[PDB]
Amino acid sequence: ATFKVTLINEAEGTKHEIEVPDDEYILDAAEEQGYDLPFSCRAGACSTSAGKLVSGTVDQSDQSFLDDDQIEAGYVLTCVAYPTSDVVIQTHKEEDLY
Ligand code: FES
C-alpha cells in the first residue's frame, strides 16, 4: 500500500502532499520527494522531528521519546513513523511539548 500524507506547516501556512509506502518512514519519503523536515537524532529519541496528527493513523512503535499521554494527544516522531492510513499531519511541533 501507498498512503497519501499531507504535511501542514501552520506557522508558515504551507501544505505539501506526498505519497508514502506503508513500509517507509514519513521523514524519508518527504525528503525523497523534495521536502526537508526538521530532524536531529533520526531515531525516535528526541523531539526535533515531532509533528501532530490532524487525521489518520501511524505506526511509530520504534519511538521511545514520547510518553503515553503525548501519544494520545496525537504527537508523532516523524523520523520513525509509518503511515497506516492516509494521514494529515502538522509538522514543526517540537515546541508544543514545552
Ligand atoms: S529526529 Fe529525534 S525523534 Fe525524530
Curated annotation (Swiss-Prot):
Consequence of changing D68K: Small effect on electron transfer
Signal peptide location: none
Positions that bind [2Fe-2S] cluster: C41, C46, S49, C79
Keywords: 2Fe-2S, Electron transport, Iron, Iron-sulfur, Metal-binding, Transport
Consequence of changing F65 to A/I: 1000-fold decrease in electron transfer
Cofactor(s), by name: [2Fe-2S] cluster
InterPro entries: 2Fe-2S_ferredoxin-like_sf, 2Fe-2S_ferredoxin-type, 2Fe2S_fd_BS, Beta-grasp_dom_sf, Fd_pln
MF (Gene Ontology): 2 iron, 2 sulfur cluster binding; electron transfer activity; metal ion binding
CDD domains according to UniProt: fer2 (cd00207)
2Fe-2S ferredoxin-type domain location: 3-95
Cofactor annotation remark: Binds 1 [2Fe-2S] cluster.
Subunit structure: Forms a complex with heterodimeric ferredoxin-thioredoxin reductase (FTR) and thioredoxin.
Function: Ferredoxins are iron-sulfur proteins that transfer electrons in a wide variety of metabolic reactions.
Family per similarity comment: Belongs to the 2Fe2S plant-type ferredoxin family.
Protein name as it appears in the record: Ferredoxin-1
Organism: Nostoc sp. (strain PCC 7120 / SAG 25.82 / UTEX 2576)
